[PDB]
Amino acid sequence: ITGTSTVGVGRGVLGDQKNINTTYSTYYYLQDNTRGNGIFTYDAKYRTTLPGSLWADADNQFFASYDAPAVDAHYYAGVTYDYYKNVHNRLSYDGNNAAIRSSVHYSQGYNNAFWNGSQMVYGDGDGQTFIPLSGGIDVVAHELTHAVTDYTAGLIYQNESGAINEAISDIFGTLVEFYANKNPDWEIGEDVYTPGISGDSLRSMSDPAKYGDPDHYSKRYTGTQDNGGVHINSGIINKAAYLISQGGTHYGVSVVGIGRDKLGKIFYRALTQYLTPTSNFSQLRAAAVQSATDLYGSTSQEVASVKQAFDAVGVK
Template sequence: MAQPSKTSPMCTIIPPDLLIHISKSDKVSQKARDGANSTLKRCDDVNKIRHAALHSRLSAASKAAGPFDLKAAPKAAAGVSHLSRTIWDCQHRAGLPIDLNHDGIPDTNIQGLPRFRGPKLAAEGHVWKDTDDQSAKNVYEQFKQTYDFFFEVLGRDSIDNHGQKLIGAVHYDEDRQPGFFNAFFFNEVMAYGDGDGEIFRSFTDIIDITAHELTHGVTEATAQLVYENQSGALNESMSDVFGSLVKQYSKVPKQDARSADWLIGRGLFLVPDARALRDMANPGTAHGNTGITGRDRQPRDMDGYRELFPPNSDPVTGNDSGGVHLYSGIPNRAFFLVATTLGGFAWEKAGKIWYNTMLDPKIRGVNPRTAFKTFADLTVKYAEEFGPDAVQAVKDAWTDVKVYPWNPVWMAAGERGEL
């Protein structure tokens, strides 16, 4: 069983190395450099609070209830939607709404994070209190699109499969030095910065950002992939996979696998330096064109994999928990290959194979250093449901990204590299 304190220590959409590059770039304003620095600091602070809260929550839960039984979780009981959304206004402060517990959130879950009495902008079935707030409108809609995908396609009733309320907090910012360049999922709350108008658009503009972050919650409720090395990269990859699928599913008309762009965070950047945060089809090509955000260093296969050890999540000096945003490109590309080889809508076969793998008890608490292999083997097993062509497509994809044939030398001490 994995150490509970290591699951998703900080689920932010912008990886630390990208913010570090912006903080040092001579091609952006001083304001942008300061914003990148203060965002790094804020993410580190929230990370520490979240780390402690998660640890106490999980240890209390394990004492009270024993091991979580995945199979015991009911699937979207009787097909009834329990979509429940609430959107709050942070009013450009570094805090979350103080009366979250009125919405059923235990106070201890957000202990230590600054809170305030911000206004509620929207609630399920209630009249808008501020109809001019585009950020609130965006998030309200994106929550529904994400909920609908998991409910309609996978039979999942919200993040916890028990109708968990979806809570958004928009206009999250720094008190003293405005400019929060990120969005994060902190326990039950999804908080969004406004962007700075120079490098980043509002983080509420991009559906796959919301879906990526909420999927971290789904992963935490199911596979609990330890957030370091290969299992951490898989954790990140799950969020990219389902983030992209939600985007494809929410298009009108719905988008098939071969028409999708397979980009994560497309449209977020206002500078020509970046097309997106990540490119699932072509890892390593999404950003860094003009040197502001740094080169996209995602390898496309295991030839570019080096075990980063020990995994360290410090946003400035760390190695991104063993390269979780770096190596997620490898399983991302495997998914892209399966989806486009099989054709049609990506969620019909590839998405279901991946989701069933997430629910398999064998993946829960998988060894972080061999997780790619365990995960790949399970996807082959779940592909059988869709026939021999699907099995072959899955095997071919893992061969293409060189997870197959598995090479134990990746875990040898001599192969350990630096970020």
């Protein structure tokens, strides 16, 4: 809509206060005109039709429980936009400052969130497995990163390419979490998963085996469920990414960590310059090695560390 750019204040799903960019026209709308071609957040009103209604509030204060998912979908969309723009010079998910649209209160007791090809969609969870999923910045950024992948490498969502696809989304979801300095960690979904159980998450990048996911190519899942294990085999790449950033010894292989910013640079370059729809794990290693070579030089520590990390997870 058309109106004056304002700054509201609210609380997100976890009760944390934060300012949000709104637009004033009779009501204050969840429309942020400060980023790209706008970040727009919608109320789906427990329906499954999308996007629903552009979110309107009478007083620019968003402290009601019903507001909380909309605050976080809106705010974390902005933060994800800021990360890709400031860190990688990427303008929104399509590189052209496309509008980022998000619908919250999708359906009822819906334990999921997803990029659907044109927008973000967030369930509220059933209160046991999940609380409203926009409360997790890594979930927001994980899903928006699928759009980035779709517009760049086009990785096919099955088998090894699909595991790389998921890992990319876990890597940049986590790097957005760190960049936002929002209680960062190498877990995925910890802020919205199982409110009754503390200290857990959907999966761990630093120790995939904590939740029974492979951390080495020899333990890769070869079944047909989960589209060939895309959410399972991603642990192999996630652990490699963790090792590149933080270092460590894994199955006897010592990795010299090079930090998160370099991890992000190397994998963003691999994603956008080298990966293709059918890239497998070995081709990802080569794309990461070449990316580190482009950025830091063939004799660099960064290149050596990438090779050590893929060695550690058994990917040649």
